[PDB]
Design an enzyme around this catalytic site. Sequence first.
Site, PDB file in Angstrom:
ATOM      1  CG  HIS C  77     -14.065  46.293  -9.052  1.00  0.00           C
ATOM      2  ND1 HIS C  77     -13.840  45.803 -10.660  1.00  0.00           N
ATOM      3  CD2 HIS C  77     -13.154  45.297  -9.314  1.00  0.00           C
ATOM      4  CE1 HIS C  77     -13.418  45.139 -11.059  1.00  0.00           C
ATOM      5  NE2 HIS C  77     -13.060  44.627 -10.416  1.00  0.00           N
ATOM      6  N   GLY C 496       3.420   2.371  14.789  1.00  0.00           N
ATOM      7  CA  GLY C 496       2.690   0.822  15.461  1.00  0.00           C
ATOM      8  C   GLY C 496       2.903  -0.369  14.212  1.00  0.00           C
ATOM      9  NE  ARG C 497       3.725  -5.731  17.264  1.00  0.00           N
ATOM     10  CZ  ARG C 497       4.013  -6.170  18.062  1.00  0.00           C
ATOM     11  NH1 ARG C 497       2.299  -6.524  18.414  1.00  0.00           N
ATOM     12  NH2 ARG C 497       4.873  -6.025  19.187  1.00  0.00           N
ATOM     13  CB  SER C 498      -0.386  -4.082   9.444  1.00  0.00           C
ATOM     14  OG  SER C 498       0.265  -5.215  10.095  1.00  0.00           O
ATOM     15  N   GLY C 499      -2.565  -2.982  11.474  1.00  0.00           N
ATOM     16  CA  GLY C 499      -4.157  -2.931  12.355  1.00  0.00           C
ATOM     17  C   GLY C 499      -3.893  -2.824  13.699  1.00  0.00           C
ATOM     18  N   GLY C 501      -4.419   0.689  13.787  1.00  0.00           N
ATOM     19  CA  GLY C 501      -5.930   1.927  13.540  1.00  0.00           C
ATOM     20  C   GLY C 501      -4.865   2.925  13.603  1.00  0.00           C
ATOM     21  CE  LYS C 502       1.330   2.236  10.704  1.00  0.00           C
ATOM     22  NZ  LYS C 502       1.162   2.493   9.559  1.00  0.00           N
TER      23      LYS C 502
END
Lengths: 50, 570, 700, 50, 50, 49
Positions: C77, C496-499, C501-502
């Site tokens: 075009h 980090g650990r579970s819980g 917040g990662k």
Amino acid sequence: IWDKQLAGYVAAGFKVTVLATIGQQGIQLIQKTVMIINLWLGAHLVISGD
Amino acid sequence: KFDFTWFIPAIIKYRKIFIETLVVSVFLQLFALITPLFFQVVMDKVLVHRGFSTLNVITVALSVVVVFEIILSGLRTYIFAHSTSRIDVELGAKLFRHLLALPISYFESRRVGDTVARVRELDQIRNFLTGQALTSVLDLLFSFIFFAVMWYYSPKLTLVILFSLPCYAAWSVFISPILRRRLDDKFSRNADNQSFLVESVTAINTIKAMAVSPQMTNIWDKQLAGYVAAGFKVTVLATIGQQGIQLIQKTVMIINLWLGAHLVISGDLSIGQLIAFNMLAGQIVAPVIRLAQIWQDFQQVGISVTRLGDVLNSPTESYHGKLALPEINGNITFRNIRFRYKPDSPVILDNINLSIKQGEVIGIVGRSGSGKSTLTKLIQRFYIPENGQVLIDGHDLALADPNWLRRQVGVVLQDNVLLNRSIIDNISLANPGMSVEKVIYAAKLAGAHDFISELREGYNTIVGEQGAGLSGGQRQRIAIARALVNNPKILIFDEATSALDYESEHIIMRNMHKICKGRTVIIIAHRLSTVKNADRIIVMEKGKIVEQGKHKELLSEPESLYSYLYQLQS
Amino acid sequence: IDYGLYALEILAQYHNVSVNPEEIKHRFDTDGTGLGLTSWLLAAKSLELKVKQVKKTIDRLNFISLPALVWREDGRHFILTKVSKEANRYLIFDLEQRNPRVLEQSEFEALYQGHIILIASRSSVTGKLAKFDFTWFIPAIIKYRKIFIETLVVSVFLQLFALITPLFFQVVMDKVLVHRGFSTLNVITVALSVVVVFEIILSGLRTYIFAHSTSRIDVELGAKLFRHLLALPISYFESRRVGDTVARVRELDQIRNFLTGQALTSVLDLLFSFIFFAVMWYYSPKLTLVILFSLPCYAAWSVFISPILRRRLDDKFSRNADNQSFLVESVTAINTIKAMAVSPQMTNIWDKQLAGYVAAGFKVTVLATIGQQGIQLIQKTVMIINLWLGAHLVISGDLSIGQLIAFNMLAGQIVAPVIRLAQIWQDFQQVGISVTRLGDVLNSPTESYHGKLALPEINGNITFRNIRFRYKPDSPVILDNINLSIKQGEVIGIVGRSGSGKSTLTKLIQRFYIPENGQVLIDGHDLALADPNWLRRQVGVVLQDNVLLNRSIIDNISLANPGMSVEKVIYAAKLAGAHDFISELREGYNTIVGEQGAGLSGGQRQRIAIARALVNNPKILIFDEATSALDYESEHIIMRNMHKICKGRTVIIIAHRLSTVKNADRIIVMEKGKIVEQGKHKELLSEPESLYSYLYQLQS
Amino acid sequence: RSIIDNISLANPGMSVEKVIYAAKLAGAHDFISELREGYNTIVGEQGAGL
Amino acid sequence: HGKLALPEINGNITFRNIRFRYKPDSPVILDNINLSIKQGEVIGIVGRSG
Amino acid sequence: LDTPVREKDENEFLPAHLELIETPVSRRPRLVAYFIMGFLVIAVILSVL
């Protein structure tokens, strides 16, 4: 920007004017139809009597 | 001169549709004339002799005649409005284009409400044109067919109507000028009221920060009372005019009744002929009655035209079209410039002579009243020097295109005014279709990205007013970004860092080498710490150059006023 | 390269519109490698500028407004500007070789193909809050006004046609029988045949045209409904069931079944029944008065019956929606139902729901039946009254037998549309319910974030600023005062650990979770009101458990852009280590994956998802515990290819195992919503008095 | 369904004692308790809330 | 709410646990500002921009 | 008839005065009665003549 806004405003005003004219013409049509009907009925009434 | 000859070319340009409207009007007059003839025929040959088939023929013809007349009248109104809409659009476009080209002295000497009202007079004109005022004029003008038919019927009553017409003309001539004067007074009061309203709404922050509601309310009360009194006077005059028209109409109606009764008694006139004559006389007068109740519209469109002329007859600082002079390289020089605020005001500059080369970051300092603040308004052709010439790239600014010059030059002032739009809409005001990456880069250059980051809406944040919603330093940074987002050959900093704190000013001064890259930058500031990194510092005293040179070249000698100013600043 | 996109960008720039080519390509270039005329026009209309592809000859190019795009079928075009007949030359902005260039008439004729697109801009759409309701159909009626005017004309002519037959019956009865008038019966017969043929043809045509236009209107409504549905926030879907939304959408099919039906034609026939009224008043006002008094009885009966039917249909729809939700949830999780052997409980629930649904349906049917019988009663009572009055009005002259039966036929023709409307009363009420329940979806705040900023592309600069997050308002806080800053090209690891917040940072970077306090900034722009399509298109996230669509291996990998060449898909599969098991399959690629990846194992879907995320070349790549479902070999392949994966991206690696983030340029340890430590691997591990050292010793 | 309904899916009529025992055995008691609704928390569609 | 006419002002200004936002969801500008200013007291307030 | 708007005419529309004035009366309170009685007396004297 002014040209765009002015064009839009004039278009809206013209639409309003068109609908006003349509309403006025409809009312005139109703009035004239009633006038014709009354003329016909009055002609019969005057020819016949009462 | 724009009084009324402006509409003649517009009429002639659309002559091929206006002639059609005229022919449609005369056909409407013929259609209207048809019906009273049918009443006369019914009254003289149906009620008298015999028959009902002729009555049916008359009725069936009348139905279609009426329907066609209604459709034709609607079409004529539509076509006339459509034709006049283009004329008012052209007038509006021309009016605004003229308004934007006016000199700044026009706006500095007036109020906003005055111009706003003078432009709403455009809407008044548009309502007059796109209406049923000129159609009534056409109906009144095309009524000689009725006069011919009436003269065929009876000459005496036709003469009575023909003599009634000059009574209408004389009554209008007598009662028009006073209505025009009253509407002039009403418009003046309306303009004052609009100006007060705009001024009070614009500065509501100061009205409410202070406690002057009662003063504003008292002024508004007095203005409203005066405006309503003027409107009542106009209404009274319009009512008097309408009643005067009605008096003539009914007087000639009574005279026609008496003369027609005496005529019918003495033969030579039937009753149906008299009824048809009365209907024709009423159809002649109906346009006059319908035009007499829109009298204010006629006078107001005249006054609106006068005010549009008041706006449109002032000279314009419009253009200098000669050879399309090329772009600007940042070469500014002054030659024997002296400037006076008014012809009856003390002189500011006397013999300021200057010459600045391309890519030269020059700083100009001084005290209050030194006259350094007028250089930025002199470079743009806003202030006209008493005598001398300001030369940019060798070419005189008094003969160049103002828009070209003011486009090539970007200026940041002590206080800047934005619009009621988003931040990106203000930064990219000169080119709204510009890429966002350029806006972000310009904002980062001015340090404006950081404070926008703590805005929830982001770059779409709407500046509440001229500058409301943002602080002084934020407004200054936004203005710097707006100036830098283009590619100005000349940058002027007219105390453009007063509202900034130390951190924002430091961030801006660290980017100064990216800001000054390839541009002629003039820095004007009260403080001496801003022009420290300039290629040349200039000291002004009472409109004269007393010292120039580098900062140290001036700081070394205590004999100079630059050293004294630096000591006071510290 | 796409020339239509560049031309649209230039033309929008000329008309003072800012456009991001990537955003337009995302939403209007679904099938890759080429915009196309229809999508180009849609994209141009998206920027609030009107366009139209028009037929223009070369001699008419002097009157069109410029600039205009010349659309060539080859795809090359160009933009035409400043046509000048002074030298018969055409200034043109060449899309390829971006600089403008002047061409003469001879080569313009070679380039021009009789196709041009006109571009203009006119103001914009004023803001308004139009909630979905029956008023939405008014603009659709206005748009399709020519068809509806045609339908009105056909309806009035059909009404005129229906008036002829009673007149013909009257003339037959009054003249043909009385005067023994043959040669008149033949004319009436021929005229009646013509009239009935023409009225049948016209009724068929009216139904055809009206059904077509209503189908188009329903298509528009359905497209709007789905576009609105896909733009709703995820919290909307998280609090509902699948069957609820499915039923709310099938109400659109209900509306379609209504629109392409006899209801609206019957209504139109009903409003045009005064033509019959004039004729019957001409015959005798005494019976026309009876009909005119009968009509308010119909209106009152309908008004009295409608609300109860609407309430019963509300209950029926509630039953139907709950039944659909139960059915969808039980079929989707049929594996769990079979494994846990909970068939009797499911059957009991189904029996209860089905019994309730059938009871509601029977109640609706009974109410509709009594309404229809109530209308029949009024019709027949008026019939008896008219028969009596007509018998008296014929006995005493003043009316003939033919006139009487013509009046009866006219009255029947008037009342019949009322009867056929009564037969579909349930349809009317159900359509009201359908519109209300469709508005239940169409009236909901969408997160589409309409605006005109058109933010540029993303550099991988992420910044958290005083982030505080709660799952729900009464829930305990997950992140207290997270303050983070990630630079471009920075491989980063969060542990980090579970819980701790990662796991919620991944759904904070995407705008799935709204922080209670603070803001997430990408490249300095706050995401709180940004375009979701701008953000989530350039962020690649691999989760612990991903779902696929039953399309194919290659169509699942290249779902975000079907225009990927097979070589790039193969490369993406090789990077994820998935090409090996894909190639050995019976079909290789093009293998159906089944419902949410049924044919594939759980460790194969993870690699498919990794390849799918890698193929789109994201600016930010997030590995939210991606390599926790894989064996040692697949994870080892992933970690060895990680160096090629991380080139030119801002990679965030969230994992439970500390060995995954050993090579990260910066590790962040989180505990109970706070970043307690951060640094390099050796810097953090060398301190025995930290949490990273304890976690490294515990896992080792 | 809720946490307790899902845990007791194989037999919806089961007392909270067995639910508590099973949750303690599986080690899920603590997290469920730390919740606001406890064992009545709705998991969403296909347990999306967990 | 107070339709009563309060008397004139002595210069005692007190901020009690002031929390303020520009917009309903914008970042908090003042967290827990507590202040007390006595009559006739000259107070200087400084700090960085923002 | 064509006199400009004076302060006497302006005070009639002052909102303070309108707030103070309760149960306002028309500016021409008895003209209608005067004209109607004039019409009646003219009619009655024309009927007897």
